CSV table of C-alpha atoms and ligand atoms in Angstrom, one decimal:
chain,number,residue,atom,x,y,z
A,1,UNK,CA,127.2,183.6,136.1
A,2,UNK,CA,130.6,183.9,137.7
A,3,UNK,CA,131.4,186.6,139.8
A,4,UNK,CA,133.9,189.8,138.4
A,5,UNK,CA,136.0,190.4,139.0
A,6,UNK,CA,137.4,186.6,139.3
A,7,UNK,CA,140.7,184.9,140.1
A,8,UNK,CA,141.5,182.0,138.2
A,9,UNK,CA,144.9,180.0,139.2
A,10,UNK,CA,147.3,178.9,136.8
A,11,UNK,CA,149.0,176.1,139.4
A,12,UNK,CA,152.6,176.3,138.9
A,13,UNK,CA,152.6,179.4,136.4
A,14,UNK,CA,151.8,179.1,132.7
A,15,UNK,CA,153.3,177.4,130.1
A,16,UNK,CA,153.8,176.8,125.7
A,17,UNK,CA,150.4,174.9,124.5
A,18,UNK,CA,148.5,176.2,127.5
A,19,UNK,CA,145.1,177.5,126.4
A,20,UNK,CA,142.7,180.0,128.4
A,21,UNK,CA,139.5,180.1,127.6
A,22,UNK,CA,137.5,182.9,128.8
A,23,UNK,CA,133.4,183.1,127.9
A,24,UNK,CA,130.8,186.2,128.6
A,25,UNK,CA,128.8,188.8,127.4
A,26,UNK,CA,129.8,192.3,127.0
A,27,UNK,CA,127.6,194.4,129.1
A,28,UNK,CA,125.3,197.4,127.6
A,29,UNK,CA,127.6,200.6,127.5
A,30,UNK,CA,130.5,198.9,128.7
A,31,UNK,CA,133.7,201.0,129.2
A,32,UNK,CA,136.4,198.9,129.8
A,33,UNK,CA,137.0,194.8,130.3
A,34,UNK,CA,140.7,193.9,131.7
A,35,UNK,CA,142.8,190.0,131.9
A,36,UNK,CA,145.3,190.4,134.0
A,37,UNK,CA,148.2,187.5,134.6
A,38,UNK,CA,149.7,188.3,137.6
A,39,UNK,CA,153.1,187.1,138.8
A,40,UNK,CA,152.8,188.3,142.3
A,41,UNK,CA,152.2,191.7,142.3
A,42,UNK,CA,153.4,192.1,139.1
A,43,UNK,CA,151.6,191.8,135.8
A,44,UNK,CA,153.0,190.2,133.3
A,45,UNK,CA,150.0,190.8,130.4
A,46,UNK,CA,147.4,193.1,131.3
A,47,UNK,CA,144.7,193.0,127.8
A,48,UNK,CA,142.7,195.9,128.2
A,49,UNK,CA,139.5,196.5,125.6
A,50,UNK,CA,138.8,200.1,126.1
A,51,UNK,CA,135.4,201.2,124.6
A,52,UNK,CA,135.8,204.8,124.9
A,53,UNK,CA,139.4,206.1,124.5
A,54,UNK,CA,138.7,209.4,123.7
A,55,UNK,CA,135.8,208.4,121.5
A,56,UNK,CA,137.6,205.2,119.8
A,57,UNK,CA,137.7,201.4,120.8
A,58,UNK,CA,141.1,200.2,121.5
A,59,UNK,CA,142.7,197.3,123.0
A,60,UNK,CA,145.6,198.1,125.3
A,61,UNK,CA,148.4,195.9,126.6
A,62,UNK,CA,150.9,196.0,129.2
A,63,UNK,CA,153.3,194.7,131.8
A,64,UNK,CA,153.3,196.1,135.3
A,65,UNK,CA,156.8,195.4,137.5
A,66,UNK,CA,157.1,197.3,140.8
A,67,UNK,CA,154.0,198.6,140.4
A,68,UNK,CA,154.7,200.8,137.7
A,69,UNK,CA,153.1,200.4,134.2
A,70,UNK,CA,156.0,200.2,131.2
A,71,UNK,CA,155.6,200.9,127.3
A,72,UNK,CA,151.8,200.2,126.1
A,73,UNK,CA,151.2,198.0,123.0
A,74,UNK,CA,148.0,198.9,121.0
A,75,UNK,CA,146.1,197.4,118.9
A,76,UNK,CA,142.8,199.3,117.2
A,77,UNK,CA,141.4,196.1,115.9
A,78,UNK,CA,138.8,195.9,118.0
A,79,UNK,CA,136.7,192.5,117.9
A,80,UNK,CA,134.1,193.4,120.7
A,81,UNK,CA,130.8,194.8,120.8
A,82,UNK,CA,128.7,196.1,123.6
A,83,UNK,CA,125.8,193.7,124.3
A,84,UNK,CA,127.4,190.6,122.6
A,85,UNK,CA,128.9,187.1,123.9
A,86,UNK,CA,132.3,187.0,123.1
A,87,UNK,CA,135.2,184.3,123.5
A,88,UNK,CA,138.8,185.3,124.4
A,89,UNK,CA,141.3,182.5,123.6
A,90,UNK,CA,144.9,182.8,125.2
A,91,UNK,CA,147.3,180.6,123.9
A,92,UNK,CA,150.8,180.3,125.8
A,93,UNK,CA,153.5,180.5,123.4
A,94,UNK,CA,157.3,180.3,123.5
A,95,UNK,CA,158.1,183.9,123.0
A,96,UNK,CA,154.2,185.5,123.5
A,97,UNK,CA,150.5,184.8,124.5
A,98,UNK,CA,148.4,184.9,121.5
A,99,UNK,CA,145.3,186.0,121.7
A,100,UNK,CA,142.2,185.5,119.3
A,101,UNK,CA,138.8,186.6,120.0
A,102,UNK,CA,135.6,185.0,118.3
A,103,UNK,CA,137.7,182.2,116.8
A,104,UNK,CA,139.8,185.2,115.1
A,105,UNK,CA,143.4,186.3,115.9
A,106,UNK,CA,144.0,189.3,117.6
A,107,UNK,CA,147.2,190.2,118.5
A,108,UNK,CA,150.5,188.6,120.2
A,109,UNK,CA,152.1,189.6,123.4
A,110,UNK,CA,155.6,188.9,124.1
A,111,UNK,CA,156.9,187.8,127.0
A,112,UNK,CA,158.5,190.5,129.2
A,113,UNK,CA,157.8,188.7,132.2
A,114,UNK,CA,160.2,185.5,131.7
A,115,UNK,CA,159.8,183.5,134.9
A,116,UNK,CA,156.4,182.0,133.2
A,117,UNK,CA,155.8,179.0,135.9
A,118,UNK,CA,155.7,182.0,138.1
A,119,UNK,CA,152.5,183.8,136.6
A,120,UNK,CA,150.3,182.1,138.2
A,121,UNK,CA,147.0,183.6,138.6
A,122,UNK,CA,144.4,185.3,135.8
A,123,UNK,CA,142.1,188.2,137.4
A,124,UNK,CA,139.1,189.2,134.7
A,125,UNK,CA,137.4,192.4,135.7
A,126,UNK,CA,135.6,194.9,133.7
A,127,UNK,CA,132.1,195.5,132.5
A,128,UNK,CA,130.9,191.7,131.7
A,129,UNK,CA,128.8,189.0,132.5
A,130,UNK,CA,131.2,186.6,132.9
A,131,UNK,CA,130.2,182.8,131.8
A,132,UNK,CA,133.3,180.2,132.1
A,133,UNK,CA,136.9,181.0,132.8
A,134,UNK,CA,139.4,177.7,132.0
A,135,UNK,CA,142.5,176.2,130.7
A,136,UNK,CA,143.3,173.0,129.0
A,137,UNK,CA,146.8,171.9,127.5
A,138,UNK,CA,146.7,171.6,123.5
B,1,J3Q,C1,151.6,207.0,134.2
B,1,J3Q,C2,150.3,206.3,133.8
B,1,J3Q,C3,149.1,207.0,134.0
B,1,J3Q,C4,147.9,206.4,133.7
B,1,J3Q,C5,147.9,205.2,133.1
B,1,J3Q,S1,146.3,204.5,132.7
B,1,J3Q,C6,146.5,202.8,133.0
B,1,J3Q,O1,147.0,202.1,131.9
B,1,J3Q,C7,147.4,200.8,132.1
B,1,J3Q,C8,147.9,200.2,130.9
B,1,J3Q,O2,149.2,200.9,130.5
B,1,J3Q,C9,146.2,200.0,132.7
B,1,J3Q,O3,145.2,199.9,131.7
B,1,J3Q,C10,145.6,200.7,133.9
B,1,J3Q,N1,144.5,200.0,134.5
B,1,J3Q,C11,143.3,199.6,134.0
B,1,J3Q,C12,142.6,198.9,134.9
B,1,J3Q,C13,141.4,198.3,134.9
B,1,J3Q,C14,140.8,197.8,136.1
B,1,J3Q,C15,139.5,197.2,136.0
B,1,J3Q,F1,138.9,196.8,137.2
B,1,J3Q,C16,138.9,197.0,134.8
B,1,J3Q,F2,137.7,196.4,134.8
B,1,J3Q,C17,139.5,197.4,133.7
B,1,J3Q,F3,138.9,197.1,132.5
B,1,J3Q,C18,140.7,198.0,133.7
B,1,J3Q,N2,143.5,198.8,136.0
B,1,J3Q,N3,144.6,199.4,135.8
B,1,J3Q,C19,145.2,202.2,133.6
B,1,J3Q,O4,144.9,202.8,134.8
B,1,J3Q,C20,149.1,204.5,132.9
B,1,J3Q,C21,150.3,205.0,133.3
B,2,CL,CL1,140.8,201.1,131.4
Protein backbone atom coordinates (compact mmCIF):
# COMPACT_ATOMS: atom_id res chain seq x y z
CA UNK A 1 0.00 0.00 0.00
CA UNK A 2 1.40 3.31 -0.90
CA UNK A 3 1.41 5.98 1.30
CA UNK A 4 -1.46 9.13 0.88
CA UNK A 5 -1.14 11.32 0.29
CA UNK A 6 1.72 10.68 -2.46
CA UNK A 7 3.82 12.60 -4.93
CA UNK A 8 4.34 11.17 -8.12
CA UNK A 9 6.79 13.20 -10.68
CA UNK A 10 5.92 13.80 -14.06
CA UNK A 11 9.89 14.51 -15.23
CA UNK A 12 9.82 17.41 -17.50
CA UNK A 13 5.99 18.19 -17.16
CA UNK A 14 3.18 16.24 -18.98
CA UNK A 15 2.53 15.81 -22.31
CA UNK A 16 -0.39 14.53 -25.50
CA UNK A 17 -0.42 10.42 -25.27
CA UNK A 18 0.79 10.51 -21.73
CA UNK A 19 -1.25 8.12 -19.60
CA UNK A 20 -1.70 8.10 -15.53
CA UNK A 21 -2.71 5.33 -14.12
CA UNK A 22 -3.91 5.54 -10.62
CA UNK A 23 -5.22 2.08 -8.66
CA UNK A 24 -6.93 1.81 -4.96
CA UNK A 25 -9.76 1.18 -2.99
CA UNK A 26 -12.19 3.65 -1.81
CA UNK A 27 -12.26 3.65 1.86
CA UNK A 28 -15.54 2.83 4.05
CA UNK A 29 -17.44 6.31 4.50
CA UNK A 30 -15.05 8.15 2.44
CA UNK A 31 -15.62 12.00 2.11
CA UNK A 32 -13.54 13.24 -0.36
CA UNK A 33 -10.43 11.75 -2.76
CA UNK A 34 -8.37 14.66 -4.59
CA UNK A 35 -5.38 14.40 -7.96
CA UNK A 36 -3.82 17.25 -7.97
CA UNK A 37 -1.17 18.25 -10.98
CA UNK A 38 0.76 20.77 -9.71
CA UNK A 39 2.89 23.31 -11.67
CA UNK A 40 4.74 24.75 -8.78
CA UNK A 41 2.48 26.01 -6.62
CA UNK A 42 -0.09 26.15 -8.86
CA UNK A 43 -2.62 23.54 -9.87
CA UNK A 44 -3.29 23.05 -13.04
CA UNK A 45 -6.24 20.09 -12.58
CA UNK A 46 -7.32 19.45 -9.25
CA UNK A 47 -10.21 16.15 -9.73
CA UNK A 48 -12.03 16.16 -6.67
CA UNK A 49 -14.77 13.19 -5.98
CA UNK A 50 -16.82 14.57 -3.19
CA UNK A 51 -19.03 11.98 -1.46
CA UNK A 52 -21.02 14.21 0.57
CA UNK A 53 -21.80 17.69 -1.09
CA UNK A 54 -24.56 18.57 0.76
CA UNK A 55 -25.96 15.05 0.58
CA UNK A 56 -24.98 14.30 -3.20
CA UNK A 57 -21.75 12.78 -4.83
CA UNK A 58 -20.11 15.05 -7.11
CA UNK A 59 -16.88 15.32 -8.89
CA UNK A 60 -15.35 18.77 -8.78
CA UNK A 61 -12.53 20.29 -10.92
CA UNK A 62 -10.39 23.11 -10.83
CA UNK A 63 -7.26 25.18 -11.46
CA UNK A 64 -5.50 26.96 -8.69
CA UNK A 65 -3.04 30.11 -9.89
CA UNK A 66 -1.63 32.35 -7.14
CA UNK A 67 -3.20 30.47 -4.76
CA UNK A 68 -6.54 31.30 -5.44
CA UNK A 69 -9.21 28.68 -6.75
CA UNK A 70 -10.95 29.98 -10.30
CA UNK A 71 -14.32 28.80 -11.91
CA UNK A 72 -15.26 25.10 -10.80
CA UNK A 73 -16.35 22.46 -13.47
CA UNK A 74 -18.73 19.76 -12.20
CA UNK A 75 -19.65 16.87 -13.15
CA UNK A 76 -22.60 14.63 -11.12
CA UNK A 77 -21.69 11.43 -12.86
CA UNK A 78 -20.19 9.91 -10.24
CA UNK A 79 -18.40 6.47 -10.99
CA UNK A 80 -17.16 5.73 -7.34
CA UNK A 81 -18.40 3.79 -4.56
CA UNK A 82 -17.35 3.69 -0.98
CA UNK A 83 -15.59 0.36 -0.18
CA UNK A 84 -14.70 -0.48 -3.84
CA UNK A 85 -11.32 -0.68 -6.00
CA UNK A 86 -11.38 1.77 -8.58
CA UNK A 87 -9.03 2.80 -11.60
CA UNK A 88 -8.60 6.51 -12.57
CA UNK A 89 -7.09 6.77 -16.13
CA UNK A 90 -5.70 10.30 -17.12
CA UNK A 91 -4.92 10.71 -20.53
CA UNK A 92 -2.91 13.96 -21.68
CA UNK A 93 -4.50 15.48 -24.58
CA UNK A 94 -3.90 18.43 -26.86
CA UNK A 95 -6.40 20.73 -25.51
CA UNK A 96 -7.62 18.65 -22.07
CA UNK A 97 -6.82 15.64 -19.73
CA UNK A 98 -9.43 13.03 -20.11
CA UNK A 99 -10.32 11.19 -17.53
CA UNK A 100 -12.17 7.66 -17.41
CA UNK A 101 -12.77 5.73 -14.42
CA UNK A 102 -13.39 1.92 -14.37
CA UNK A 103 -12.47 1.66 -18.06
CA UNK A 104 -15.49 4.36 -18.59
CA UNK A 105 -15.08 8.04 -19.58
CA UNK A 106 -15.70 10.57 -17.31
CA UNK A 107 -15.16 13.88 -18.12
CA UNK A 108 -12.50 16.26 -19.98
CA UNK A 109 -10.50 19.00 -18.48
CA UNK A 110 -9.10 21.69 -20.56
CA UNK A 111 -6.04 23.07 -20.28
CA UNK A 112 -5.90 26.36 -18.43
CA UNK A 113 -2.57 25.85 -17.39
CA UNK A 114 -0.60 25.96 -20.83
CA UNK A 115 3.05 25.63 -19.90
CA UNK A 116 2.33 21.56 -19.81
CA UNK A 117 6.15 20.39 -19.58
CA UNK A 118 5.94 22.61 -16.52
CA UNK A 119 3.28 20.43 -14.47
CA UNK A 120 5.32 18.29 -13.24
CA UNK A 121 4.29 16.50 -10.19
CA UNK A 122 0.73 14.46 -9.31
CA UNK A 123 -0.20 14.64 -5.46
CA UNK A 124 -3.29 11.91 -4.66
CA UNK A 125 -4.80 12.48 -1.24
CA UNK A 126 -8.08 11.70 0.08
CA UNK A 127 -9.77 8.87 1.85
CA UNK A 128 -8.10 5.66 -0.12
CA UNK A 129 -5.98 2.88 0.01
CA UNK A 130 -3.88 3.69 -2.56
CA UNK A 131 -2.42 0.58 -4.67
CA UNK A 132 -0.20 1.82 -7.83
CA UNK A 133 0.36 5.30 -9.09
CA UNK A 134 2.10 5.42 -12.92
CA UNK A 135 2.45 6.70 -16.35
CA UNK A 136 3.31 5.16 -19.54
CA UNK A 137 3.32 6.94 -23.17
CA UNK A 138 0.46 5.39 -25.58
C1 LIG B 1 -13.52 30.88 -2.14
C2 LIG B 1 -13.54 29.41 -1.97
C3 LIG B 1 -13.98 28.84 -0.75
C4 LIG B 1 -14.01 27.46 -0.59
C5 LIG B 1 -13.65 26.62 -1.61
S1 LIG B 1 -13.75 24.88 -1.26
C6 LIG B 1 -12.39 24.24 -2.19
O1 LIG B 1 -12.76 23.97 -3.51
C7 LIG B 1 -11.67 23.68 -4.35
C8 LIG B 1 -12.17 23.46 -5.77
O2 LIG B 1 -12.72 24.69 -6.27
C9 LIG B 1 -10.86 22.48 -3.80
O3 LIG B 1 -11.62 21.34 -3.87
C10 LIG B 1 -10.43 22.78 -2.34
N1 LIG B 1 -9.64 21.71 -1.81
C11 LIG B 1 -9.98 20.41 -1.57
C12 LIG B 1 -8.87 19.79 -1.05
C13 LIG B 1 -8.65 18.44 -0.68
C14 LIG B 1 -7.55 18.09 0.10
C15 LIG B 1 -7.33 16.78 0.46
F1 LIG B 1 -6.30 16.43 1.22
C16 LIG B 1 -8.15 15.78 -0.01
F2 LIG B 1 -7.93 14.51 0.31
C17 LIG B 1 -9.22 16.14 -0.80
F3 LIG B 1 -9.97 15.15 -1.28
C18 LIG B 1 -9.46 17.43 -1.15
N2 LIG B 1 -7.88 20.75 -0.98
N3 LIG B 1 -8.33 21.89 -1.44
C19 LIG B 1 -11.63 23.16 -1.47
O4 LIG B 1 -11.20 23.54 -0.20
C20 LIG B 1 -13.20 27.19 -2.82
C21 LIG B 1 -13.15 28.56 -3.00
CL1 LIG C 1 -13.22 18.32 -0.73
Amino acid sequence: PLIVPYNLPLPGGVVPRMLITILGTVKPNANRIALDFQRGNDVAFHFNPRFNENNRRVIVCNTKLDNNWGREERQSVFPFESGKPFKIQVLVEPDHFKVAVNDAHLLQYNHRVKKLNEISKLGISGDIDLTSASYTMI
